[PDB]
Amino acid sequence: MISLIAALAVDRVIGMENAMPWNLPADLAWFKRNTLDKPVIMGRHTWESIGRPLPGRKNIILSSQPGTDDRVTWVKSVDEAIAACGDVPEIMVIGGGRVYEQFLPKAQKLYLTHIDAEVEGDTHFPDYEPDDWESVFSEFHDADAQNSHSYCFEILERR
Numbered sequence: 001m002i003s004l005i006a007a008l009a010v011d012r013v014i015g016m017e018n019a020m021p022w023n024l025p026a027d028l029a030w031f032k033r034n035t036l037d038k039p040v041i042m043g044r045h046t047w048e049s050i051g052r053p054l055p056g057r058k059n060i061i062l063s064s065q066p067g068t069d070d071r072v073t074w075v076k077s078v079d080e081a082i083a084a085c086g087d088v089p090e091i092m093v094i095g096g097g098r099v100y101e102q103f104l105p106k107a108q109k110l111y112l113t114h115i116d117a118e119v120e121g122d123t124h125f126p127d128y129e130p131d132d133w134e135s136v137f138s139e140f141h142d143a144d145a146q147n148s149h150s151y152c153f154e155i156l157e158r159r
């Protein structure tokens, strides 16, 4: 099954100039918890902003261009990306915007982190139809010493 995993600030902003403005260590924690030991799909920019392979995960990168690093797996299409994953129970799509736009309709579950933060971004999460989805998990957190804003973890399943 395909799942989208993402972190959103105010107004579905997800990035700015190839990066994430805020710093929310609890989000990284949770991102890692959720993707560890599973395959992660990500676009070329996102990989670039990551600058390295994520351990304990099969890294799959989508580019129309040929690979330039054997540490990860390169693919040139959404189909191939998914085939490259093999037979596993869950595929984690991690970004960025274009990639999410493409996998949304094929996805059965959303892992969203709602961040209480106002940032001028240049990239946004897709506009998805709430009707279609169901909140199965929700947990709120106030900002703290490690985390500068309040946030909320959420899991939704397509009805």
Ligand SMILES: NC(=O)c1ccc[n+]([C@@H]2O[C@H](COP(=O)([O-])OP(=O)(O)OC[C@H]3O[C@@H](n4cnc5c(N)ncnc54)[C@H](OP(=O)(O)O)[C@@H]3O)[C@@H](O)[C@H]2O)c1
Pocket (backbone or CB within 6 Å): 005, 006, 007, 008, 014, 015, 016, 017, 018, 019, 020, 042, 043, 044, 045, 046, 047, 049, 062, 063, 064, 065, 075, 076, 077, 078, 094, 095, 096, 097, 098, 099, 100, 102, 123
């Ligand atoms: N907050 C979040 O959770 C989160 C998670 C990830 C990323 N982000 C942010 O997202 C922004 C980067 O997002 P982005 O939309 O600019 O880039 P992206 O989605 O990561 O990368 C886009 C690219 O991936 C390739 N690609 C995508 N679909 C393809 C397909 N069907 N076939 C072949 N290649 C395909 C293309 O590479 P080629 O040009 O080489 O073909 C295209 O340039 C950054 O700001 C990052 O910080 C946020």
Ligand SMILES: CN(Cc1cnc2nc(N)nc(N)c2n1)c1ccc(C(=O)N[C@@H](CCC(=O)O)C(=O)O)cc1
Pocket (backbone or CB within 6 Å): 005, 006, 007, 020, 027, 028, 029, 031, 032, 033, 046, 049, 050, 054, 055, 093, 094, 095, 112, 113
């Ligand atoms: C660029 N970026 C993409 C990124 C970041 N936060 C997100 N947060 C959420 N919720 N969802 C995403 N898709 C997301 N994607 C990154 C950057 C660094 C690491 C990273 O180091 N991850 C460690 C986290 C633990 C550590 O901080 O050492 C891991 O192993 O998963 C991951 C994603």
Ligand SMILES: [Mn+2]
Pocket (backbone or CB within 6 Å): 158, 159
């Ligand atoms: Mn149902």
